[PDB]
Amino acid sequence: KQFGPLVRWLKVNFSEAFIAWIHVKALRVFVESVLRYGLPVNFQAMLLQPNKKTMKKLREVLYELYKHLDYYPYVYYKIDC
Amino acid sequence: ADVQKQIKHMMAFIEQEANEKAEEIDAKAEEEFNIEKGRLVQTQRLKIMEYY
Amino acid sequence: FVAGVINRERIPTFERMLWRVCRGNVFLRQAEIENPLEDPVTGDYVHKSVFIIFFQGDQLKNRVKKICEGFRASLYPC
Amino acid sequence: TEFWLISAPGTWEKLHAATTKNNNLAVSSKFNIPDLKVGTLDVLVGLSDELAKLDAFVEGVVKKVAQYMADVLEKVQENLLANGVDLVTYITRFQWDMAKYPIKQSLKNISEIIAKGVTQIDNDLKSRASAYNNLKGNLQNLERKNAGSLLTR
Asked: Which of the residues bear the PTM Phosphotyrosine (chain B)?
């Protein structure tokens, strides 16, 4: 009897927790990008997508674009589950 | 070169700090105005009702 | 506002860290003092440099005082 | 699987499409974020430490929910998010604007509402799963009392 209730309670909780944690990292990306990059009114907010076993080249590709622009020389927040 | 960018980032910030505290007194100048007016009305009502 | 003194050998890594953790910015003034002075045990006969920490914000004062002690800077009230 | 999350401010959003030309690295979706209420520089710096504190607590409490899911029927990744997988949700999510009001203060008010809301589910599910684990352990003792020699069973 308690297994059916706890699985419904976990599905109510864990789906709301991941949506809140994604909203928490979005506020964390909203902050510290207004200070690193300038704020005339707002910053140019874009995002990215995960990568498998090629992130050593992705870090090399991102640092080449960011060293001329400007721990990283840009804004970054890891979110791995 | 990048130092001249960070100058106008801060000058955008300090001017923004002057703006937002001006709006919170802009709201305060009308939030107290409609409640101070009814306060003197009620006491002048209580003065004019006793002499009535 | 903070005014203070730091040696010449630690000033380029100081502003690299000062740009890093403050990260809005503080408009740093770089100016080297003349012929070497000496605080008694640290440091013995070194020519230092002044700096200027205005920043106008009065919140980043906590975030710079840790850096001023971490790089062992000597600060005086102006 | 990991998840990478990089903003590049400085059109410039077409330089985001120039990063889509790097197809051998990632797809690099957009994930539009609405304009939040700003206006503080002192409180924004202080909120950066609080957002760092709230991020580690909320993800860490969520990791215990996955461990408590193995206590139910013992692997399977069925964590659907708004009738969607976690990759498909995060590619096209946004701020809900009603669960966290954009008109309210994003530094204090919208952050603590997400904080007290998550901590309400964190404390309640920690206590509720302890009751279901208490009945599961005693039923194993009911199987342990029906085991062994006849002098002890």
From this structure: 51
Compute the half-sphere exposure of residue D135: CA atoms within 13 Å on the CB side of its CA. Answer: 9
Contact between chains at B20 and D41 (C-beta distance less than 8 A): no
Integer CA distances (angstroms), D146 to C72, D135, D137, D152, D153, in order? 71, 17, 14, 9, 5
Question: In the numeric block, which tokens belong to residue D16?
Answer: 């985001």
Q: With contacts defined as CB-CB under 8 Å, which chain C residues touch B4?
A: none
Task: State the smallest CA–CA distance between residue B20 and chain C in angstroms.
Answer: 15
Coil, strand, or helix at residue B52?
Answer: coil
Resolution in A for the shown PDB structure?
3.8
Position D29: which residue type?
S
Question: What is the pairing mode between strands C31-32 and D6-7?
Answer: unpaired
Does the bond joining D148 to the residue before it have cis omega, within 30 degrees of 0?
no
Contact A20, D58 (CB under 8 A): yes
Q: Do B9 and C27 touch (CB under 8 A)?
A: no
D109-145 and A3-30 helices, crossing angle to 10°:
150
Measured between beta carbons, the chain A residues lying within 8 angstroms of C24 are: 35
Q: Side by side, which strands form the sheet with C31-32?
A: C31-32, C48-52, C3-7, C74-76
Classified as helix, coil or strand, C75 is strand
